[PDB]
């Protein structure tokens, strides 16, 4: 040993660091990373909110105080979107006076407003109960509009209170416009999970998706209400088709061949109320089944989505979820844990040259 | 219509000064030929993909970042680990080592550039600063000095930050796609930045205005570095092509590609005299081109996964290559 005293001490420090790295890096393999994917307005932020409510610490009243401004931006954004869709669908107002109220909303600075008082409250209320505005809400099929618009404009009076505090449901149904990867860890029966949510990042996916080569599974949220909306606010494009394209792109990535796919079909309730008015056959010709049934629609959508799998070397766990009400998202979480355990099983069997 | 005319006049003026090519004027020089480099040291300890490394200015210390969520500072001469920094975000794509050695940087999918002080009286490495304000992931960062750092993001924008206040001193907008790499001039009065629009830009740090724009790649420019005089810089794209751009000529000079190379470059770096351009590739290799002729292709074939980062010391005495198989090799 030609080393001096100080270099022997340096070797000692390097070995200490070796041990610390080994410890931390074996902790970093007990935690399973689930990459949460899907299209916009599919129900994945509400998904993380729900499991935070039922597996994290929940939202304290300080968080609700932080969320209230976002709630008011949501109410203004939905009202403005309906107002704009009125002037693009070529439908006039039944009441002329409320038109002026509509103007009062058209110039609002959505990103800047933090107070919600009169006459804005009265203007919004007088707009919403217009027969023309109700017709526009009924025909919201042809334009982008948050699904929680009915829920907020039928509790306007509650949210217009000077002492209004958002409830758990209000927290669920509000956009938090944060950009960047969000990691959220979990304890499912002494198993550490972590949902990695992207999609708040508007950058190109190909440049940071290989970073998720080491994910246990991909939780792909498709919305069952995406049919019967070929938005006319832009070029005529179905939303189911966008979801299918994204699903194919995800399940053809070489990064994700080691990771299973859990497909969650969401907004099933809204499918139930859409079936009573609109049927699949008008937009998907390959469909052939009952017109006013919902289970047939659900299984058609699932069969259509699971057959995008190019190969027989990847199984797709699937679920019918409604990521707004609890005690159904608990079922979704149990299904996630079970599917991830099965994925780990199959990976170990493949490594042991058994499966 | 005036924009098209300005692009038209630039192109016709662009072709005027391209009387010859770098290949024609280099037919009278002796090739270095095969260069056999050896793994003098294999630095082990990273447990996941290595995404960036940066040499120290003493040519001996070395910081490297992995998706294991950790930076490691290595004494490259003795394979000793000098520091181990656990990161708050494990989705790190870049790291930097300060010229004075007091500081390290990192950043990634959190859109935040974290600066860590290395010379503390408390004996550990503390997070000196967290620079936030980018709306996309950070792909590269480079200390101008202990006080200022430039960060490139997927915002299509770069940002020169004053660290001691944490605010963007200047912003560099103008790219169309995500900015992926970044290189500082030797005097650090300029930098060069390539983005996912196949074009790079030469940016003025002081005045904050884009001086120059270089086009010619066919895909994302995900690797960029300066020739040691600061008058030239070599890009690496997904086209399986590296390319040399000289700032004075305002053109492209020589390409670095081959018929059997189909995968994109992850990293580029020059040799101390600029006679060697080492280029890390997605075929698990790390080529070594004679930067003056483009026909050397020495191979540092020691990695079993994609070579994601490489670098040459400030005395050109070695070259470190880190790859996706979590190993750093020091070739001399």
């Amino acid at each position, epitope marked *: 040993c030609t080393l001096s005293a100080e270099d022997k001490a*340096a070797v000692e420090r390097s070995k200490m660091i070796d041990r610390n790295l080994r410890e931390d890096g074996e902790k970093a393999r007990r935690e399973l990373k689930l990459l949460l994917l899907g299209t916009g307005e599919s129900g994945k932020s509400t998904f993380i909110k729900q499991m935070r409510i039922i597996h994290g610490s929940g939202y304290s009243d300080e968080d609700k105080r932080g969320f209230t401004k976002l709630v008011y931006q949501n109410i203004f954004t939905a009202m403005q979107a309906m107002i704009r869709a009125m002037d693009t669908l070529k439908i006039p107002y039944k009441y002329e006076h409320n038109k002026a109220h509509a103007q009062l909303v058209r110039e609002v600075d959505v990103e800047k407003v933090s107070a919600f008082e009169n006459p804005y409250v009265d203007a919004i209320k007088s707009l919403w109960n217009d027969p023309g505005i109700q017709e526009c809400y009924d025909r919201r099929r042809e334009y982008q509009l948050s699904d929680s618009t009915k829920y907020y404009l039928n509790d306007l009076d509650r949210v217009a209170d000077p002492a209004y505090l958002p409830t758990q449901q209000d927290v669920l149904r509000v956009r938090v416009p944060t950009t960047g990867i969000i990691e959220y860890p979990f304890d499912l029966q002494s198993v550490i999970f972590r949902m990695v949510d992207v999609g708040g990042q508007r950058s190109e996916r190909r440049k940071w998706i290989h970073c998720f080569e080491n994910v246990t599974s991909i939780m792909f949220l498709v919305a069952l209400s995406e049919y019967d909306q070929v938005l006319v606010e832009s070029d005529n494009e179905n939303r189911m088709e966008e979801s299918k394209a994204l699903f194919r792109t995800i399940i053809t990535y070489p990064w994700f061949q080691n990771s299973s796919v859990i497909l969650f079909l969401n907004k099933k309730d809204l499918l139930e109320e859409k079936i009573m008015y609109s049927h699949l056959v008008d937009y998907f010709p390959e469909y052939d089944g009952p017109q006013r049934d919902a289970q047939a629609a659900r299984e058609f959508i699932l069969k259509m989505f699971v057959d995008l799998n190019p190969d027989s070397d990847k199984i797709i766990y699937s679920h019918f979820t409604c990521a707004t009400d609890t005690e159904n998202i608990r079922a979704a979480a149990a299904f996630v844990f079970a599917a991830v355990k099965d994925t780990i099983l199959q990976l170990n069997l493949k490594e042991y040259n058994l499966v | 219509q005036e924009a098209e005319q300005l692009k038209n006049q630039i192109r016709d003026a662009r072709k005027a000064c391209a009387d010859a090519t770098l290949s024609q004027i280099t037919n009278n020089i002796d090739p270095v030929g095969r260069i056999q480099m050896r793994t003098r040291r294999t630095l082990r300890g990273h447990l996941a993909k290595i995404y960036a490394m940066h040499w120290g200015t003493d040519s001996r210390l070395l910081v490297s970042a992995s998706q294991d969520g950790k930076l490691i500072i290595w004494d490259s001469y003795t394979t000793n680990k000098v520091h181990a920094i656990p990161l708050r975000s494990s989705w790190v794509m870049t790291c930097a080592y300060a010229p004075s050695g007091n500081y390290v940087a990192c950043g990634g999918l959190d859109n935040i550039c974290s600066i860590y002080n290395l010379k503390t009286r408390e004996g550990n490495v503390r997070v000196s600063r967290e620079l936030a304000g980018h709306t996309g992931y950070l792909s590269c960062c480079r200390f101008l000095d202990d006080n200022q750092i430039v960060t490139s993001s997927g915002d299509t924008t770069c940002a020169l930050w004053d660290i001691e206040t944490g605010q963007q001193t200047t912003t560099f907008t103008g790219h169309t796609g995500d900015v992926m790499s970044l290189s500082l001039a030797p005097d650090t009065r300029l930098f060069v930045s390539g983005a996912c629009d196949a074009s790079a830009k030469l940016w003025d740090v002081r005045e904050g205005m884009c001086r120059q724009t270089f086009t010619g790649h066919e895909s994302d420019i995900n690797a960029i570095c300066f020739f040691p005089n600061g008058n030239a810089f070599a890009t690496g794209s997904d086209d399986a092509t590296c390319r040399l751009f000289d700032l004075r000529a305002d053109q492209e000079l020589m390409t670095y590609s081959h018929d059997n190379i189909i995968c994109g470059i992850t990293s580029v770096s020059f040799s101390k005299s600029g006679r060697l351009l080492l280029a890390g590739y997605d075929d698990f290799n790390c080529n070594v081109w004679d930067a003056l002729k483009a026909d050397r292709a020495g191979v540092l074939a020691g990695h079993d996964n994609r070579v994601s980062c490489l670098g040459v010391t400030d005395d050109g005495m070695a070259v470190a290559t880190g790859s996706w198989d979590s190993f750093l090799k020091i070739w001399n």
Partner: single-chain antibody
Amino acid sequence: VQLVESGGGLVQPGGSRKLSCSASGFAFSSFGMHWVRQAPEKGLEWVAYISSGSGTIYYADTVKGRFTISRDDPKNTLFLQMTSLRSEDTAMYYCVRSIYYYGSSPFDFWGQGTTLTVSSADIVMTQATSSVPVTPGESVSISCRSSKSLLHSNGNTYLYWFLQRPGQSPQLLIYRMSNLASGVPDRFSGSGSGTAFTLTISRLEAEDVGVYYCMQHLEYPLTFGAGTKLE
């Protein structure tokens, strides 16, 4: 960044004493610790060393087996257990913080020590003279010698120059024969050849008086010289 020693006092002939050191304000679990003597009318003298991680322990050939160094990282308390105290054990005992990576400045921060009053192959470091008369504002230079060459074949030279001001604990000035410790004015420098070392002070100010010490760290034990008293 603070080290407090405790446990010193008057001990009966023989006997035993446990001296503690509480570290506060730094990462004491990432630091090696030394115990360093100093007689009431003599220079310093190294006692012991414990490593970062408790891996290795070193004693001097005048206390070995009769001492015991130890540490407790959760409570950041270093210990020297001391047994069978002969007359030659009456000294101030200082706890020295010392880290070792590439670039570290060992012996940078010392504690305040604590008095304890009891009722040849080693490198020999040797001062030139006991004192040097000087004048404020002048330039001063002391010298020191080593039996071996402290230039290790790795390029380092493990000479250390320390300052102990009257009524104060020591303070690293020069680490590894040339490098100025943090907080030391740039007025100091150290240079020489193997087995011949000189410490130079330019623009000699007040409170720069004291005793300057030349220690070596090339091997254990760590050997001091008498140290020149700049007065």
